[PDB]
Amino acid sequence: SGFRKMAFPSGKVEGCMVQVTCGTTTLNGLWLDDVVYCPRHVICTSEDMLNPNYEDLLIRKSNHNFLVQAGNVQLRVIGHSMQNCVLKLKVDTANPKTPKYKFVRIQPGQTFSVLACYNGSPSGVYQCAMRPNFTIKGSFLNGSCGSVGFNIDYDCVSFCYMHHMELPTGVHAGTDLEGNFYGPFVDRQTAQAAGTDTTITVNVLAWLYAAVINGDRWFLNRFTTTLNDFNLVAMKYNYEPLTQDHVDILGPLSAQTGIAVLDMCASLKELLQNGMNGRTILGSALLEDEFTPFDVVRQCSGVTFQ
Amino acid sequence: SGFRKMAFPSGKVEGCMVQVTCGTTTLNGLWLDDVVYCPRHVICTSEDMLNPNYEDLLIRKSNHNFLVQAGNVQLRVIGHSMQNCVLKLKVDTANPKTPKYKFVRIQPGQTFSVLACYNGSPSGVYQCAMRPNFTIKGSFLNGSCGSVGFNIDYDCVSFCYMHHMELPTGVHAGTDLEGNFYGPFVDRQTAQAAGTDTTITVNVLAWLYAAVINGDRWFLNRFTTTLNDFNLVAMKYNYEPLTQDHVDILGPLSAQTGIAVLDMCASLKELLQNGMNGRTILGSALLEDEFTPFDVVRQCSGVTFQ
Ligand SMILES: *C(=O)[C@H](C[C@@H]1CCCNC1=O)NC(=O)[C@H](CC(C)C)NC(=O)[C@@H](NC(=O)C1CCCCC1)C(C)C
Numbered sequence: 009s010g011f012r013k014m015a016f017p018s019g020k021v022e023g024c025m026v027q028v029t030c031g032t033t034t035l036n037g038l039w040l041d042d043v044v045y046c047p048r049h050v051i052c053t054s055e056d057m058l059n060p061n062y063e064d065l066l067i068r069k070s071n072h073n074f075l076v077q078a079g080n081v082q083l084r085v086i087g088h089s090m091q092n093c094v095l096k097l098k099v100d101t102a103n104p105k106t107p108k109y110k111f112v113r114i115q116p117g118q119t120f121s122v123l124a125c126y127n128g129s130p131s132g133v134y135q136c137a138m139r140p141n142f143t144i145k146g147s148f149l150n151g152s153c154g155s156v157g158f159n160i161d162y163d164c165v166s167f168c169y170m171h172h173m174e175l176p177t178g179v180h181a182g183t184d185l186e187g188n189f190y191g192p193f194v195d196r197q198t199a200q201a202a203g204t205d206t207t208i209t210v211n212v213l214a215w216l217y218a219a220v221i222n223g224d225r226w227f228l229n230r231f232t233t234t235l236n237d238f239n240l241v242a243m244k245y246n247y248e249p250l251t252q253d254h255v256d257i258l259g260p261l262s263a264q265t266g267i268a269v270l271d272m273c274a275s276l277k278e279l280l281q282n283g284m285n286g287r288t289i290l291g292s293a294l295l296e297d298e299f300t301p302f303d304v305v306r307q308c309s310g311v312t313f314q
Numbered sequence: 315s316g317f318r319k320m321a322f323p324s325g326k327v328e329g330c331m332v333q334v335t336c337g338t339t340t341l342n343g344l345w346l347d348d349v350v351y352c353p354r355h356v357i358c359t360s361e362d363m364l365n366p367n368y369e370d371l372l373i374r375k376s377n378h379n380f381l382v383q384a385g386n387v388q389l390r391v392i393g394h395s396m397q398n399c400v401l402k403l404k405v406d407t408a409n410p411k412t413p414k415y416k417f418v419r420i421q422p423g424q425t426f427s428v429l430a431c432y433n434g435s436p437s438g439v440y441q442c443a444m445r446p447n448f449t450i451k452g453s454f455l456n457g458s459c460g461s462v463g464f465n466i467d468y469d470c471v472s473f474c475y476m477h478h479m480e481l482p483t484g485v486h487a488g489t490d491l492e493g494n495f496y497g498p499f500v501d502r503q504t505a506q507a508a509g510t511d512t513t514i515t516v517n518v519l520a521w522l523y524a525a526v527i528n529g530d531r532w533f534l535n536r537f538t539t540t541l542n543d544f545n546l547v548a549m550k551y552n553y554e555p556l557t558q559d560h561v562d563i564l565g566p567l568s569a570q571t572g573i574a575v576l577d578m579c580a581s582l583k584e585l586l587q588n589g590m591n592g593r594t595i596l597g598s599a600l601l602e603d604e605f606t607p608f609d610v611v612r613q614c615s616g617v618t619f620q
């Protein structure tokens with residue numbers, strides 16, 4: 009038993025991290041086959057980031073201006089191209105540690121593991137969720153750009169996020185591996201408003217199901233509710249509306265616990281309107297919304313990866 | 315900025331996990347050089363675990379009775395020995411993925427990363443702390459035994475924990491890699507009382523320092539306190555006493571924030587006696603005690619590993 013914030017094993021991603029240096033700016037790159045992917049603002053100076061002209065800055069750069077180091081061995085760049093907000097540096101050596109990989113663009117509410125790196129070396133791994141406002145609540149310092157978010161399915165690593173910037177709110181914004189930002193953000197040091205965040209309701213319900221599987225059942229009440237009446241209450245507390253698709257995704261958890269989804273919604277409705285009265289659920293005094301139903305079933309059934 | 319529960323990169327440990335099968339019982343093993351380490355109750359049946367005679371059970375076992383598989387390749391056992399509560403299976407092939415490693419016995423209050431494995435395949439990675447009562451609050455299912463806890467220092471993996479059992483309280487007990495249990499526990503299915511847990515005070519203070527570094531400063535009050543008067547209040551709320559050694563360990567965090575340790579203790583004293591009044595610190599409504607001062611400085615300074 010037990011339930012913990014669990015991240016994917018990072019071994020397959022660790023073998024792909026390199027250091028990319030262009031002048032003074034050094035950050036991390038993703039070495040897949042004979043291509044190194046990294047944020048394009050590596051070609052920027054501190055004065056350029058206020059309003060950078062990336063194409064103009066890149067034209068003044070040639071292949072030798074990019075210092076790519078994998079561990080202690082330097083990789084030679086033999087070509088560079090810019091795809092949206094990421095640079096693609098073709099190197100003369102293909103990464104022998106390249107795993108089976110995929111480039112995916114995740115949806116809001118989905119989770120992924122972040123491998124925080126500095127100077128091409130991993131610092132730690134943690135689990136994140138794509139917030140409804142297309143930000144993430146990560147842990148990034150100077151030089152962390154190029155760190156990637158990923159999921160592992162069987163033996164295939166699904167790269168879905170690359171870190172680019174931090175907003176003064178404390179949250180972080182980035183792109184997919186094709187260079188397209190998540191949300192209305194741009195890679196420039198200027199005022200950008202992030203929309204108000206919302207609680208991921210289907211993830212809270214999945215977390216409550218995990219609590220039942222682990223023996224934390226005090227919050228279960230004797231009532232049921234309709235999907236419409238639940239969403240009217242959840243909307244009041246800044247919860248996303250629960251769709252029938254979300255009810256279907258919670259199917260596996262509902263059958264394992266014998267608790268209908270609308271019955272669990274009735275318990276969540278009482279938790280929102282009355283609070284916890286100083287009690288905890290799975291060791292938390294707040295409702296957790298960064299566990300997908302797939303995360304819950306994977307941890308509660310022991311799904312492994314190759 | 316930002317602060318997350320962060321685990322070490324698991325790549326160096328992933329290359330050491332194998333599947334160990336003895337009859338029906340299958341669990342995980344740690345393949346280091348030409349030795350595979352695994353919990354000794356792999357030689358037990360479900361009826362044996364009530365009161366097992368491990369030496370008698372092992373004498374009836376020969377080398378071929380241990381099926382060790384690394385991925386899809388079977389490793390041949392050429393010798394077996396029992397050291398306390400772990401089996402040491404000598405295999406004819408030395409693990410080419412063996413990293414620089416060390417066997418350490420951690421102290422209560424220290425943290426480490428757990429790589430949860432099933433059938434020798436990693437499922438996820440998360441950060442744990444050795445509770446004062448020598449248990450851990452992990453996430454383990456059937457077949458997780460053999461999963462190891464570890465820290466990474468520079469390039470050396472310090473193995474410190476191997477999972478053995480779960481108590482009905484929901485907590486988990488295990489051994490170091492020499493087979494010696496943490497706490498007064500034995501590897502048998504019988505009633506065993508775990509001592510009452512205690513909040514790790516120096517870790518809470520380190521967590522409050524992390525909050526200040528990340529801009530969460532509302533809890534800082536204008537008062538100071540003595541080390542003795544703080545421990546009298548902390549004892550009332552089941553906090554471990556703060557020693558001068560703990561004050562010295564908090565030195566780096568105190569100098570970075572300019573907040574004396576006894577000043578932060580005065581703020582923690584007010585938090586304990588008055589609560590948070592519905593407010594959060596680093597997104598938590600409860601005080602976190604599973605971050606060491608070393609964990610805080612590593613995440614707040616970006617320490618990497620080879
Ligand atoms: C890359 O390594 C770096 C990581 C940042 C900086 C360090 C703090 N935490 C991080 O994740 N990214 C970086 O420097 C960004 C470069 C882009 C401008 C291309 N810059 C930022 O992230 C800056 N953030 C902002 O300017 C926001 C943008 C929208 C709202 C106003 C301020 C930070 C603050 C340096």
Ligand SMILES: *C(=O)[C@H](C[C@@H]1CCCNC1=O)NC(=O)[C@H](CC(C)C)NC(=O)[C@@H](NC(=O)C1CCCCC1)C(C)C
Nearest residue numbers: 009355454455456457458459478479480501502503506
């Ligand atoms: C090994 O894979 C397995 C992992 C356990 C079992 C599954 C639940 N979560 C885990 O971590 N360990 C295992 O089966 C133990 C074998 C030893 C007896 C050698 N058994 C247990 O962990 C059992 N726990 C107990 O018997 C406690 C011991 C002290 C208090 C009374 C009950 C579990 C409950 C099967």
